[PDB]
Amino acid sequence: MISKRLELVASFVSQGAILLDVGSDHAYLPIELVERGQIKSAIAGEVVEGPYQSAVKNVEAHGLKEKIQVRLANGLAAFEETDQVSVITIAGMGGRLIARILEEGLGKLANVERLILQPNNREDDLRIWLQDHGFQIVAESILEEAGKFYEILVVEAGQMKLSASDVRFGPFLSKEVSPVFVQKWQKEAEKLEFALEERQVLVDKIQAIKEVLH
Ligand SMILES: C[S@@+](CC[C@H](N)C(=O)[O-])C[C@H]1O[C@@H](n2cnc3c(N)ncnc32)[C@H](O)[C@@H]1O
Numbered sequence: 001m002i003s004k005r006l007e008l009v010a011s012f013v014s015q016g017a018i019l020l021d022v023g024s025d026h027a028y029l030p031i032e033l034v035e036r037g038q039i040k041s042a043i044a045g046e047v048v049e050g051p052y053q054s055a056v057k058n059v060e061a062h063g064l065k066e067k068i069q070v071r072l073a074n075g076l077a078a079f080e081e082t083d084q085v086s087v088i089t090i091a092g093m094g095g096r097l098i099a100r101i102l103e104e105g106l107g108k109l110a111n112v113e114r115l116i117l118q119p120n121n122r123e124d125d126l127r128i129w130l131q132d133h134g135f136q137i138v139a140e141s142i143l144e145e146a147g148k149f150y151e152i153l154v155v156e157a158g159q160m161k162l163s164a165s166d167v168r169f170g171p172f173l174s175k176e177v178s179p180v181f182v183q184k185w186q187k188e189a190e191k192l193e194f195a196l197e198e199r200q201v202l203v204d205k206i207q208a209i210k211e212v213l214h
Contacts, residue, residue: 013039021089021090021091022089025054027070041068092120169212
């Protein structure tokens with residue numbers, strides 16, 4: 001049933017957690033996770049009525065009223081420190097909105113063990129942000145689904161000084177340099193050459209891709 005992307009995200013969720021899933025369409029992720037006993041309880045939070053309603057309903061349907069709360073809230077407003085959240089997933093958004101959300105709610109994060117994040121784009125910018133604000137990446141996955149590529153970033157409390165390669169391609173994605181890693185950046189590399197002395201932004205970009213794949 002559950003999407004293959006949403007599958008990965010779930011797989012980094014600390015066994016026993018209390019989850020907050022920001023932008024939980026349809027509550028699919030907290031729902032599966034509650035169902036397989038991998039988490040204790042959850043909060044699905046959504047920012048507009050459409051999705052909020054959808055999540056409310058699906059939770060009833062799976063009769064999980066007393067295991068998942070659904071809140072119409074914007075980003076981290078969705079919880080307070082009393083909810084005692086251990087893990088937050090934030091999936092299916094732009095890199096920079098993910099940053100803005102973490103940004104506008106940075107306060108709340110001190111007692112949060114882990115942060116599972118699937119940006120849609122702007123993966124680099126998030127990394128710059130995450131570095132600059134006292135977060136370190138502990139784990140990274142990539143996957144293909146139905147044409148589209150999807151980076152997942154697992155994060156904790158910490159310092160990290162990243163290479164400019166590591167911001168662009170990812171600390172862990174370019175360690176174990178997988179096949180899915182390779183088409184992404186390949187596909188992107190020809191996308192570039194296709195385009196090709198501002199015609200120079202590209203050269204080095206292209207060169208960087210050549211380099212991390214080599
Ligand atoms: C591409 S969907 C992904 C939903 C789910 N996390 C997933 O990846 O499968 C983006 C969803 O994020 C929701 N969202 C919830 N809270 C948000 C917030 N606080 N700021 C921006 N988008 C938010 C939007 O309403 C929308 O339903």
